[PDB]
Amino acid sequence: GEASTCWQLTVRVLEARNLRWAADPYVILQLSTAPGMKFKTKTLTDTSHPVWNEAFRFLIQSQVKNVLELSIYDEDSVTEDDICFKVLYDISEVLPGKLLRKTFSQSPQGEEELDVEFLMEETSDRPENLITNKVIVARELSCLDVHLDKLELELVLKGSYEDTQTSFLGTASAFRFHYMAALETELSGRLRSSNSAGYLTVPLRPLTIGKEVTMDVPAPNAPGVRLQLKAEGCPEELAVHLGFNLCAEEQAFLSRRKQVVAKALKQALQLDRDLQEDEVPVVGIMATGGGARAMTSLYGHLLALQKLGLLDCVTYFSGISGSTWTMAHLYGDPEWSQRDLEGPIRYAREHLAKSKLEVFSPERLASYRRELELRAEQGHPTTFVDLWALVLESMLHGQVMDQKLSGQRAALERGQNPLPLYLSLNVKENNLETLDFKEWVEFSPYEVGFLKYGAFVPPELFGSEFFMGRLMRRIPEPRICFLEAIWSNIFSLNLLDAWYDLTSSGESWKQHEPLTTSGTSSRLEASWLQPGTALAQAFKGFLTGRPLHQRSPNFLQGLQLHQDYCSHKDFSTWADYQLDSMPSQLTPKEPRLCLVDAAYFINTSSPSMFRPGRRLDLILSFDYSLSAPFEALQQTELYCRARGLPFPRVEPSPQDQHQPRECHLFSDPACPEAPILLHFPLVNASFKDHSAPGVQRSPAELQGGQVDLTGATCPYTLSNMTYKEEDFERLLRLSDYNVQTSQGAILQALRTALKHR
8 A cells, every 4th residue: 555646758759760661650659557558640751761749748657667668660551560660768767857868779780760858747646546565566546437328339448458348229238447547548439330420538637536427429310328427446455465475364374284283293203392383393395297107106205294194294285287186186175184095095096097098988078079169158268278177187087076276275274284385387478589488376275376476366266357456357266177287288288299290380389208118208108198099089170279378367467567676575586587677578467377387497396485484494305207306406406596595405416316215305504594305206216125114025025116117118107197006006105115214304304493493
């Protein structure tokens, strides 16, 4: 909540020189913080050195980043006009009272020039009512309602979210426009039919008070139609949460969870006394990706922690890609960590064992089609992610699984499970420049949002349409398989490569394990994925046109960047330098997101462990890579170091790399702020010999420790979705064993974590 006064900017477009020949030039002015308000000079004819001398006026909010775009176009009545000049200008340079004369130049030797003058002046308006977290700004919003007592009515309000609304008489009763209170704009109204009637305009002055007008819109060959409109302040309450600390629900959860942790810690460490709230260490589990391999192994890791009584000591549980499948299934049961994990294990084993060719029955394929047809009619886009959602759902459960992310709040109501954190990356879609622009989007049962912008919504509202932090249109929360599809949409790319011989136009390639018996990649080889299947036959053609990634409505839409967003600790932490220094090119102005599996970039769920407020003391890092078990940890360390996030050195010895063990400690006692890391690579070491911690195995039971992690015919390759129960059990029991045998190291780390707190 903040009051801030606006200035008036006069932009005088004088002249340009040395423009390229066809020119018939005109200048366009756009302001990044006034979308839909374009100014246009007159078009001059056959000059190459145009002199316009036209002035235009904007209301400017000093507390937001304001980028003025000045573009010169060459007018052509036949083809779309070519741009001959473009500059982006941060108007914070222009100081009030002092006329600033500017000559803009294109290139270092570029000969084209544009002369402009800027004057910033004070106004007598009241201050604007802004809401910020000091990086994102919600501008003051006004709301205007139009009510009405064949003909088509057209209502236009330049600068509003809706912009233009049309309707036949009778067919539309009422209209709402949302627009910034700081705009000088107007509502224009007119009636059209198949002589044209005159239009009426009602001016909308900046920061005005509510008002009420009645006017009669003239019809063609018929009498006037009476409309009533009232402009009012929009209520100053946002559906989007703006702030860089934990939300109320997560804070409340922590108090609940820390009681369960304090108790479980006392029992596990055989502690003398009861732990004070401030002494309870914050422990996190952090899982990487790796399809069904990650899913299976993570089940085993959780079983171990349960048996050791250490699962109750865990506060946070983060994951990406295949790990989210384990998480999603478990958090469907509100009591999962308090119940024998062997039940969910069995469920997963049986579904992973069934034939994935016969799962694609005609009934099932028809159901996919029917569902996608309905979704399309409902106005959802159709992408690879949508099909992958339904197929993945079928493989994991064999039926529609009507559970939602918001329903996972029940699993946290008594602090009886850890808080689950699911990660994805927001990317720019179909833009060959900006390939490595990437923003972490965190999902939990309490909120979904951007770590960089400090902006979140409840999961039930993710996918709904927003403007300036307000909910514009509520879309029903999807089934969890649709989120699982986003989280693991590396499989959308694998489906695309396996199905389509892309020697083609689509340059959405993105294009990111033990080789086969043929010496080829194991990536695109599993039964379900092959080009001749019932699945492919039904859907290969259907999917041809379509994007790889979901086109999710952006809940940040219309929000603006604060004037000093760059010099904010948390934005700076997450900022991709070059693109992030360009505020007009940031995510808030996009109507849509493009959400991608973290496995496209970096195979870690660690960013959620470093959101401000979480304060992790110990992290159990589970890594499911089949090669390079330290790669993910090392990249995350570099990633953290570049952003000034305290994290221990990850310096395994040559011996460690040659033969990794079940558990590696990475910890820097010199820096207490940095968390302790216990890292569990996917390796079959002592388990080859031992059926249990410190227990050798009967020769009969030698087969149980023969886990095929390395040769060709490795059944745990990324795309394989069919595990023989034999192979499932080995991976699961290996994972279980590797954690159990490390009990000592975990308890030691817990003790150290305790001392530090």
